[PDB]
Design a protein around this nucleic acid. Structure first.
Ligand SMILES: [Mg+2]
Ligand SMILES: [Mg+2]
Ligand SMILES: [Mg+2]
Ligand SMILES: [Mg+2]
Ligand SMILES: [Mg+2]
Ligand SMILES: [Mg+2]
Ligand SMILES: [Mg+2]
Ligand SMILES: [Mg+2]
Ligand SMILES: [Mg+2]
Ligand SMILES: [Mg+2]
Ligand SMILES: [Mg+2]
Ligand SMILES: [Zn+2]
Lengths: 60, 24, 80, 98, 206, 155, 118, 127
RNA sequence: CCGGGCACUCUAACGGGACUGCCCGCGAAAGCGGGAGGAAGGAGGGGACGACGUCUGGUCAGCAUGGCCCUUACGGCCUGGGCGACACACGUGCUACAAUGCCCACUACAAAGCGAUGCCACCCGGCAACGGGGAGCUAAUCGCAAAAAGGUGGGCCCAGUUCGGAUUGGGGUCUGCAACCCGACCCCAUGAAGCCGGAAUCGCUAGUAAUCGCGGAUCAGCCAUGCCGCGGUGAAUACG
């Protein structure tokens, strides 16, 4: 996203309401997971790399 | 029917509880 | 069916400034921005110009409408 | 009785170091309760393959966290010796409470 | 378009995750960004070395930030004049204080992450793509490998219009898990424009 | 079915008469996949035949069926212009299906409220010799033999 | 009989027949059929000139149904209008009130479609 | 005095114990015709016995847990066929023709993406 | 439920098993047809997996990135509005138009998941949502949970009607600094179009379609009938 809009990490937003994850790396606000603090993209990126332990390619 | 709010299945579907769907 | 609850809300901004105009007797027009702010008896007579998002609309309050909210009287959009 | 809950991300690494914390406790004490598996708690992920539109793709990712027990009989006081802190694996995290 | 990252497609088998440490819960989202910051600045420097893999291990405080390279004698700096300043920058990240026990890589031309780096380096230096390629292929196919392959992106030669240069020899099956093929990506910025370079090196088998 | 002549997937016998025809019928009756109530509906009517016959239920059934199955039905065949309505003998398999399907169909076409009544009174009209069942039947044969002028466009 | 202002349910069940009343629904029934104890499932035809009275007196003078009701509601709307209330508006301009999408599906409030040359 | 044939089905396991008894077949502390109250089929489960002229000349106590009444109706029909042979082996002989001894592999398929359910695929237009 | 015990179910690792290997028929062979054994038979059933390349495909609003353009505004903070407008048009869906159904009471089996400021047992007040009080759990051992359809019983009796819940008036709870614009949920009243859909058109070949309900992600709350998974019952038909 823009740069200003990366102040989310502002401990004092004013009200816990404005607390929006926003991907850590890309900053991708949408598709952001919790268990990873990542957007559906960066997720699948590293996943394929292998920098996320236990995280395998689901099959069943 | 499966969509009438003030009824039995109306809650079962709308996913709720009320005077029309208590517990025990 | 408007659910405020068991603890009404009114953004102080004017609450204080409107409650004070009563001390001098009355005033002459105001102008809120918290159209979200409910309404109380101490309005009757006043004139709180609310924002539409573009302008400051003079909403002449009245007994009948004392229970409503500023916003319902400041029309947002335009059409025909 | 010694509660040992071995939980790792892989069925080998972990499971392996859970056939150790027994031998080193099969002589110095009760023949143990053998290592008990316990079902796995899986965290599943699915994400639109590419970015922008194309929502009819997805690809799937899991995260199986296996479990293990073992459990023994009477803190032999002399078993803790063969065990104590002679570990070695790093892809595990077992907690305790006998 | 068709295809995957055989690496992420082989983790189940022929490939152990970069970071091999159980944990999770209210920590995974943490002990994760950890590595990122690690292998993050960790690349900003060791570029000159052959920074291939960079495993990571944990279990309790005492981490294990390894690092492979083809230029170990570079990591060290001077008996310990470098391998120190850096293990210090570690407390500016992992306050959890960790090692750094380095290791080395045999033949920097089988380490895909590098083979590609090189082809990139070359290219970034205004080199002859298709030539460098047919070379790297050899630098790699010409040392043990059962098969390799290199792929340079577009804007070849600077061409005002994207292209794609191939080249590769010997078996390089990918639809086969039992494969084991180091995959190496290499970015390669340029005066006129970016352009990655992929590196595939099929070795061993079963 | 471009590959092979699909097999006439046999069906399990009836939980009573142990018949297959009967089953098939129950199957046609059932909807939304509720073999239960259907087993009933039909069975419940297998009885109603009695209150109106000293006859046996099964026979009545067999007769209703073996009576509504057609012999020659229409069939299109466009040829260098417009599509003609051609006849032709009828398959021993398309007999059954085309019949049952019509019974359970004509049944649900009646005024009777209690579902089972319908089917029940329907098999009867059927086995007997009239009603919507044999209607749609003797209404197809009549369709062919009305275009029997295309015995040259066989197959 | 003629319970609420001029009523006429008959031949049917009662907990059903009362329904045919304005301020009466499948709810205010059971209540009245209890606050006045009556075997619910009885054909109104088979009603006691004695119960019809308690039933009437209750329902009539216990609520605000029929005629008098139709006027109250209309009164709130008519009121809603008098003041520049948003809601008081959508009513004037035949359009959904409770915050709904007036683009697609809006028929019920708007009625028949007025298809125009697009 | 005792026999045990299993029989699973669509995720339904049935422990089928067989005892020489006169034939008081029953399930989870609930009469057979009482766990399968008005379920046309059910009877099926016993077909195996009914098939070996048994039925009345043999008693059965059975368990079951998992799946749906039906599935159980089937699983049970299996154990009752399994232990039934776990008893007399020369029993398969003509118990196999019908095959009341063959784990019904047919199991619910998965839900693939971009669909509504394995096969049921979204409909479209202007094409 | 406590002692007791791993035989069974299961939980989860590891192997075993099936190869046209066996018998008949045909063939030059591959292999095709049929039969026995067998849990399964000829790729047993479903996934992950998509070749050289094509469409100058999509995305410089994910991220990276060559050039260009603005640097007191094409940057930045904020508050209110907007993304939610409406005379209409199309797409994908949901709920129906009913008696193989709807309603109340009682009663019976699932699988996969989630749970720290979180799942909330049990008791209490309230018609209710929910509020107050409060046990256990870091969770095969406690909670979300009830599965629903189904089964035994009784209600309606073919009616726009006990079908159908749109729309609108009124009262109220929970999240949040704040629900006018613009949230969901409950109780009451309201009870609309709709009685099976023109020309045309979509899906699916077996545990599938059809049908019933359960969880999850995101997330304070929610506009999820959507998306992604689970399992219950369980067909028709394929000449060609
Ligand atoms: Mg940026
Ligand atoms: Mg938020
Ligand atoms: Mg209804
Ligand atoms: Mg999507
Ligand atoms: Mg879609
Ligand atoms: Mg393949
Ligand atoms: Mg283009
Ligand atoms: Mg474009
Ligand atoms: Mg929008
Ligand atoms: Mg009406
Ligand atoms: Mg009708
Ligand atoms: Zn990312």
């Amino acid at each position: 996203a823009r740069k200003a809009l990366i102040e989310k990490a502002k401990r004092t937003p004013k009200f816990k309401v404005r607390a929006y994850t926003r991907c850590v790396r890309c900053g991708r606000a949408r598709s952001v997971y919790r268990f990873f603090g990542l957007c559906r993209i960066c997720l699948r990126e590293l996943a394929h790399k292998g920098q996320l332990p236990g995280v395998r390619k689901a099959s069943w | 029917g499966k969509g009438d709010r003030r009824t039995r299945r109306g809650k079962i579907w709308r996913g709720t509880y009320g005077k029309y769907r208590p517990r025990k | 069916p408007r659910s405020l609850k068991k603890g009404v809300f009114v953004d102080d901004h004017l609450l204080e400034k409107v409650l004070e105009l009563n001390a001098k007797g009355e005033k002459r027009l105001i102008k809120t921005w918290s159209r979200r702010s409910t309404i109380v008896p101490e309005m009757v007579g006043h004139t709180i110009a609310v924002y539409n998002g573009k302008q400051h609309v003079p909403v002449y309050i009245t007994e009948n409408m004392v229970g409503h909210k500023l916003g319902e009287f400041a029309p947002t959009r335009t059409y025909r | 009785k010694i509660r040992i809950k071995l939980r790792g991300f892989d069925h080998k690494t972990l499971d392996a170091s859970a056939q150790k914390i027994v031998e080193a406790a099969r002589r110095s004490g009760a023949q143990v309760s053998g290592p008990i598996p316990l079902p796995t708690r899986v965290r599943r992920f699915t994400v639109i393959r590419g970015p922008f539109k194309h929502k009819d793709s997805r690809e799937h990712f899991e995260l199986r966290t296996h479990n293990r027990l073992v459990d023994i009989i009477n803190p032999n006081r002399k078993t803790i010796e063969q065990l104590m802190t002679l570990d070695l694996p790093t892809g595990v995290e077992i907690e305790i409470k006998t | 378009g068709n295809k995957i990252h055989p690496i992420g497609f082989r983790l189940g088998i022929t490939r152990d995750w970069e970071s091999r440490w159980y944990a999770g819960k209210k920590q995974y989202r943490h002990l994760l960004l950890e590595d990122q910051r690690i292998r993050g600045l960790l690349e900003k420097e060791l570029y000159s070395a052959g920074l291939a893999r960079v495993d990571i291990e944990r279990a309790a405080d005492n981490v294990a930030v390894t690092v492979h390279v083809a230029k170990p004698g570079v990591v060290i700096g001077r008996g310990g004049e470098r391998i120190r300043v850096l293990r210090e920058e570690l407390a500016k990240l992992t306050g959890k204080n960790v090692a750094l026990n380095v290791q080395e890589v045999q033949n920097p031309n089988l380490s895909a992450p590098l083979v590609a780096q090189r082809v990139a380096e070359q290219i970034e230096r205004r080199f002859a793509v298709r030539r460098a390629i047919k070379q790297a292929v050899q630098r790699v196919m010409e040392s043990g490998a059962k098969g390799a392959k290199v792929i340079v992106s577009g804007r070849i030669g600077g061409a005002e219009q994207a292209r794609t240069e191939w080249a590769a020899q010997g078996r390089v099956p990918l639809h086969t898990l039992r494969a084991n093929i180091d995959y190496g990506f290499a970015l390669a910025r340029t005066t006129y424009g970016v352009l990655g370079v992929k590196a595939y090196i099929f070795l061993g088998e079963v | 079915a471009r590959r092979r002549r699909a097999e006439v997937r046999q069906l399990q016998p009836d939980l009573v008469y142990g018949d297959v025809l009967v089953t098939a019928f129950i199957n046609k009756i059932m909807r939304d996949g509720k073999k239960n109530l259907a087993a009933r509906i039909f069975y419940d009517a297998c009885k109603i035949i009695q209150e109106k016959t000293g006859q046996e239920p099964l026979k009545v059934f067999k007769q209703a069926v073996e009576n509504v199955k057609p012999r020659m039905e229409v069939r299109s065949r466009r040829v260098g212009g417009a599509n003609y309505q051609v006849p032709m003998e009828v398959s021993p398999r398309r007999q059954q299906s085309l019949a049952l399907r019509w019974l359970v169909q004509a049944a649900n076409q009646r005024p009777e409220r209690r579902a089972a009544v319908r089917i029940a009174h329907e098999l009867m009209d059927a086995a007997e010799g009239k009603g919507g069942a044999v209607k749609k039947k003797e209404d197809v044969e009549r369709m062919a033999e009305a275009n029997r002028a295309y015995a040259h466009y066989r197959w | 009989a003629r319970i609420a202002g001029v009523e006429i349910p008959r031949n049917k069940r009662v907990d059903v027949a009362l329904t045919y009343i304005y301020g009466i629904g499948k709810a205010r029934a059971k209540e009245a059929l209890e606050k006045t104890g009556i075997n619910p499932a009885t054909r109104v035809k088979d009603l006691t000139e004695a119960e019809v009275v308690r039933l009437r007196e209750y329902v009539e003078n216990t609520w605000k149904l029929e005629g008098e009701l139709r006027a109250e509601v209309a009164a709130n709307i008519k009121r809603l209008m008098d003041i520049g209330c948003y809601r008081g508006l959508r009513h004037r301009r035949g359009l959904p009130v409770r915050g709904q999408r007036t683009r697609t599906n809006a028929r019920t409030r708007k009625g028949p479609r007025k298809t125009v040359a697009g | 005095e005792q026999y045990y044939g299993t029989g699973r089905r669509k995720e339904a396991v049935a422990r089928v114990f067989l005892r020489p008894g006169n034939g008081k077949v029953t399930v989870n502390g609930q009469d057979f015709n009482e766990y399968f109250q008005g379920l046309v089929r059910a009877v099926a489960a016993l077909e195996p016995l009914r098939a070996v002229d048994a039925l009345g000349r043999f008693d059965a106590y059975i368990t079951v847990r998992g799946g749906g009444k039906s599935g159980q109706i089937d699983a049970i029909k299996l154990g009752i066929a399994r232990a039934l042979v776990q008893y007399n082996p020369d029993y398969r002989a003509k118990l196999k023709p019908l095959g009341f001894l063959t784990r019904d592999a047919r199991v619910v398929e998965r839900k693939k993406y971009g669909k509504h359910k394995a096969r049921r695929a979204p409909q479209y237009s202007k094409r």
